[PDB]
Design a binder for this molecule. Structure first.
Ligand SMILES: [K+]
Ligand SMILES: [K+]
Ligand SMILES: [K+]
Ligand SMILES: [K+]
Ligand SMILES: [K+]
Ligand SMILES: [K+]
Ligand SMILES: [K+]
Ligand SMILES: [K+]
Ligand SMILES: [K+]
Ligand SMILES: [K+]
Ligand SMILES: [K+]
Ligand SMILES: [K+]
Ligand SMILES: [K+]
Ligand SMILES: [K+]
Ligand SMILES: [K+]
Ligand SMILES: [K+]
Ligand SMILES: [Mg+2]
Ligand SMILES: [Mg+2]
Ligand SMILES: [Mg+2]
Ligand SMILES: [Mg+2]
Ligand SMILES: [Mg+2]
Ligand SMILES: [Mg+2]
Ligand SMILES: [Mg+2]
Ligand SMILES: [Mg+2]
Ligand SMILES: [Mg+2]
Ligand SMILES: [Mg+2]
Ligand SMILES: [Mg+2]
Ligand SMILES: [Mg+2]
Ligand SMILES: [Mg+2]
Ligand SMILES: [Mg+2]
Ligand SMILES: [Mg+2]
Ligand SMILES: [Mg+2]
Ligand SMILES: [Mg+2]
Ligand SMILES: [Mg+2]
Ligand SMILES: [Mg+2]
Ligand SMILES: [Mg+2]
Ligand SMILES: [Mg+2]
Ligand SMILES: [Mg+2]
Ligand SMILES: [Mg+2]
Ligand SMILES: [Mg+2]
Ligand SMILES: [Mg+2]
Ligand SMILES: [Mg+2]
Ligand SMILES: [Mg+2]
Ligand SMILES: [Mg+2]
Ligand SMILES: [Mg+2]
Ligand SMILES: [Mg+2]
Ligand SMILES: [Mg+2]
Ligand SMILES: [Mg+2]
Ligand SMILES: [Mg+2]
Ligand SMILES: [Mg+2]
Ligand SMILES: [Mg+2]
Lengths: 86, 205, 79, 81
RNA sequence: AAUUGAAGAGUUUGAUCAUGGCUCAGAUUGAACGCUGGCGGCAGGCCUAACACAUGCAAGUCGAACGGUAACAGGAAUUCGCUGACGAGUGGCGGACGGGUGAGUAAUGUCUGGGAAACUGCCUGAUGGAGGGGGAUAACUACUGGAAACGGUAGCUAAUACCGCAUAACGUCGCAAGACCAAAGAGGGGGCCUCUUGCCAUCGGAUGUGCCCAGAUGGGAUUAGCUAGUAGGUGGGGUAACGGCUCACCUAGGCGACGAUCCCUAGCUGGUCUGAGAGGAUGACCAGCCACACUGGAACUGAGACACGGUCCAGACUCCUACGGGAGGCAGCAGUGGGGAAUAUUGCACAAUGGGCGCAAGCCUGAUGCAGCCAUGCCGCGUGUAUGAAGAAGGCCUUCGGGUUGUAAAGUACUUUCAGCGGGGAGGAAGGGAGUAAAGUUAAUACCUUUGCUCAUUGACGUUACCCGCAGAAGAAGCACCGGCUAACUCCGUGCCAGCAGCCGCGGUAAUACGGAGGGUGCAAGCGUUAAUCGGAAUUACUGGGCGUAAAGCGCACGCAGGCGGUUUGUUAAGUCAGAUGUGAAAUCCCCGGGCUCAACCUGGGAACUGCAUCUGAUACUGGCAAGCUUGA
């Protein structure tokens, strides 16, 4: 980088990447648990894992890590698969 | 940007008087008017049809003192304006300030009237104008500046103007040395030895 | 109302889809003669009701596959 | 944002501004949304040196359009007939 | 008022008419070259190497988010962030704009007209919120690695940095019941109040962006077949969003002589040049769109980038190194080398317009405004005016009489633009800053806001434009051509030589054609030449041509696609016609005007944009559908 403000933007964006990456990993881990429970065909556990996922994707959408439409898609796709598990 | 050579060779090539001298003498008392200039000037030219169109255009140019680029632009405007193109072209040449000043009598010739315009001695509606090609509008007042009212050539020019036919589209006051441009001269008010249809056809060749 | 084209079914071998040929009649830009031009559209045909030859009736919609953006309104004439 | 400013036209030493509504990001003499008047700063006497469509200006201000400082001054002199 | 518009000539023959090519006169240009060159205005200026680049500059800003104190400046006494302020740091916003280039791209793009399944910082409207906590971290301090670039270890600290908890409905998911999600303070003043500004949620507006469809947009068939995520379907995933976007499975499709695939060339448009028009050619400057940023690839951050002056990897080049390792990207402005027939200054200023940040003052701005260079183009002006026969000299010609140069010069009268010198002197300036008084607010004459008034100020250009004065014709003309086309003729030199030439042709001892001269013609601060486009060329003919013998009827048929279709009635309203509405950016062109002394140039208003779509009508003709008829078959 040649310009002073470009140097700082590089430092800042790298710090933002690590912060974003840990939260993105965290959210994906929780979504995967719902899909794992649906695989096992366990509606009780699948409904459970859905319930801690739900506040997670909503807070991340509000913080700007994903979009509201993406949070809504996960909740809709998983709800639709959980209800068919009966 | 101005012809600066002998003046009578021009009129001798065109075989007529171009009013390029003041008029105190007769054009035949200063030159062999009916003979073209040069060593072979006594020959009888067999002018082609192009040559007859060309000489008519060079005549009108040499009267008013316009060069070719400026004249070609007059023609383009004359063709653009509504009406008869040939007559539009004559009205545009008669609207020139240096021509109007001469027709008013303030200059003995069009070259002298041009020097008066160039040297800042003429006003149009009350403003100094030193552009020889300025177009004078109807009702415009052309006048001599005060510091130039005492020049001896302006009265010598005013005493030769009544020796010629008075233009009826103007209105000069030799006293206050100012005139009014009442209207554009009609084709009838202009000379009849100018065959402007030859010029219009030349610019379609 | 809704804009709407009308044409003839030239293919029905896809599942829920048909190819429809629309004929236009336009003046040639240089020679002035009125000539026939054709456009083939891929059309969504739920129920798979159309057969090769029928005169159908289509409208424009959202994309439904890579090439389909039109959907069958009605059948005007059956072959 | 949408702004109302002057685009400099005319000739050298003789500017002539057009009053335009434009996305502020666009170049001064570039893409604009709608022209709503002009302003000639060297206009001669008896010549109209400023004309503004205040009904179009008021329409855009009501949609959130900001106004440049020079156009603000021009609106005042026009309203102060 | 806005379509006032159309020229031919030469050359085939002993001669003719026709056919047919070739050649010329015109307009034009980002031009170049040769000769020449006074001034000004407005514009234009790497078309080649998307070649390589020395140096400087082209993106910052905010202390009214925060801890702070390196300054220097005050206040306090070498000490104190106590104040004006401010280096480095954290944080916000900007850096995705502005600017450059045309490599790639033949439709992925562009143009025109439609469309649905989307997001959108700053700006704007509405309704509600803005409670209560926590753990860090740079800076800094100590030690330490390294030649450097760049790091390591420990400890401390702040916030509008970060993260829970609370709050949760016109929001998200769900049929429902229900479940679930946010936030930040700062600043001015005051007998905690108040005002200003910011923060969060949802729903709108506006703007911007993503996506889909139809028609249009180069050449090649001595490229005819192409395609397996290929075409469609179902389900999962994915995106802001529809979608083979992606994956699994099923079907076996999809494209193509209305030119697929392949190959060559190319940024597209508004427009520009030419043309009477129809067309043909073209896409520099200006404006819209797209693509690219040393080469190849990738994502991160972010409202927005797969990012010109950001990050990572690889590569080629250049450079530094202590040999371990590091650095760089002018197709920003100026500039250098190189290539080339050829294209400019390492300028001034943020005064104006506009952009970033800021409450503002302000700071930044090679955008921009200007200046420098170049006849590159367009336009204007000057280089004197009047007089002057001795028809002087001198030149050239001469049948020796003279003719011509030529009123030309000299002479004699005059004027003084521009250049030169001196003096005066507009406009581009709007504003902002201090004051004030009033009104609005508030508990408050405070602050703040608004509106007036008052006082001092702000121009890079710049020795501005422009005006006045002084002096003296004083400082200012060239280039091509003169046999015919084609305006303009003689002598001398040369003798198929030297040479000219666009063509016809010229030159062989009487050359208007070569070379010089005198004279003349055409343009003129330019004139010629070369290159290139259209024209003339009705010589690709749609407008607007031909085929017995000039080039040209397939050796003859049958026949699919295609083109075309006798006559009557009805119906339809696709073609066609009429009207309306929307759109067809601005500039350009055209018309009527306006402003620069004029013009170029700038500019107001119209017309035009000959198209597309939709709606409503007309029904003669063409088409569709139905029913016939008999003259074609
Ligand atoms: K910063
Ligand atoms: K011949
Ligand atoms: K011929
Ligand atoms: K940004
Ligand atoms: K290109
Ligand atoms: K909180
Ligand atoms: K695919
Ligand atoms: K699918
Ligand atoms: K074109
Ligand atoms: K590239
Ligand atoms: K940029
Ligand atoms: K500025
Ligand atoms: K003599
Ligand atoms: K003599
Ligand atoms: K001889
Ligand atoms: K024809
Ligand atoms: Mg799904
Ligand atoms: Mg000139
Ligand atoms: Mg699908
Ligand atoms: Mg280039
Ligand atoms: Mg600082
Ligand atoms: Mg925060
Ligand atoms: Mg909560
Ligand atoms: Mg093209
Ligand atoms: Mg798609
Ligand atoms: Mg799918
Ligand atoms: Mg290219
Ligand atoms: Mg023609
Ligand atoms: Mg992101
Ligand atoms: Mg960048
Ligand atoms: Mg760069
Ligand atoms: Mg450069
Ligand atoms: Mg060279
Ligand atoms: Mg700087
Ligand atoms: Mg001023
Ligand atoms: Mg002749
Ligand atoms: Mg001889
Ligand atoms: Mg010769
Ligand atoms: Mg032709
Ligand atoms: Mg023929
Ligand atoms: Mg024969
Ligand atoms: Mg033959
Ligand atoms: Mg035969
Ligand atoms: Mg047959
Ligand atoms: Mg018929
Ligand atoms: Mg119809
Ligand atoms: Mg337009
Ligand atoms: Mg005027
Ligand atoms: Mg106009
Ligand atoms: Mg009918
Ligand atoms: Mg019929």
């Amino acid at each position: 980088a040649n310009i002073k403000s470009a140097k700082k933007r590089a430092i800042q964006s790298e710090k933002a990447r690590k912060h974003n990456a840990s939260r993105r990993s965290m959210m994906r881990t929780f979504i995967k648990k719902v899909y794992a429970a649906i695989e096992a065909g366990d509606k009780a556990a699948a409904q459970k894992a859905f319930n801690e996922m739900q506040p997670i994707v909503d807070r991340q959408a509000a913080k700007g890590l994903i979009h509201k439409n993406k949070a809504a898609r996960h909740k809709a796709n998983l709800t639709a698969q959980i209800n068919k598990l009966a | 940007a101005r012809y600066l050579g002998p003046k009578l060779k021009l009129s001798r090539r065109e075989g007529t008087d171009l009013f390029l001298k003041s008029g105190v003498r007769a054009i035949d008392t200063k030159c062999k008017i009916e003979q073209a200039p040069g060593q072979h000037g006594a020959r009888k030219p067999r002018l082609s049809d192009y040559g007859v169109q060309l000489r008519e255009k060079q005549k009108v140019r040499r009267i008013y003192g316009v060069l070719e680029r400026q004249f070609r632009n007059y023609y383009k405007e004359a063709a653009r304006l509504k009406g008869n193109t040939g007559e539009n072209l004559l009205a545009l040449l008669e609207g020139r300030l240096d021509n109007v000043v001469y027709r008013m009598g303030f200059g003995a010739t069009r070259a002298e009237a041009r020097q008066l315009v160039s040297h800042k001695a003429i006003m149009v509606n009350g403003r100094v104008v030193n552009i020889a090609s300025y177009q004078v509008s109807p009702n415009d007042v052309v006048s001599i500046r005060e510091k130039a009212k005492k020049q001896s050539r302006v009265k010598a020019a005013l005493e030769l103007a009544e020796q010629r036919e008075k233009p009826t589209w103007l209105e000069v006051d030799a006293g206050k040395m100012e005139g009014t441009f009442k209207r554009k001269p009609e084709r009838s008010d202009l000379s009849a030895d100018i065959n402007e249809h030859l010029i219009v056809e030349l610019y379609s060749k | 109302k809704i804009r709407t084209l009308q044409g003839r079914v030239v293919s029905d071998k896809m599942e829920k889809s048909i190819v429809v040929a629309i004929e236009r009649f336009v003046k040639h830009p240089i020679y002035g003669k009125f000539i026939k031009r054709t456009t083939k559209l891929h059309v969504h045909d739920e129920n798979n009701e159309c057969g090769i030859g029928d005169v159908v009736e289509i409208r424009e919609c959202r994309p439904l596959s890579k090439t389909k953006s039109w959907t069958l309104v009605r059948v005007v004439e059956k072959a | 944002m949408v702004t109302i400013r002057l685009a400099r036209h005319g000739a050298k030493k003789r500017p002539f501004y057009q009053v335009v509504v434009a996305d502020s990001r666009n170049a001064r003499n570039g893409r604009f949304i709608e022209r709503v008047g002009f302003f000639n700063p060297i206009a001669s006497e008896k010549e109209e040196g400023t004309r503004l469509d205040l009904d179009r200006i008021a329409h855009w201000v009501g949609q959130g359009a900001t106004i440049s400082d020079r156009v603000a001054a021009l609106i005042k002199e026009v309203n102060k007939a």
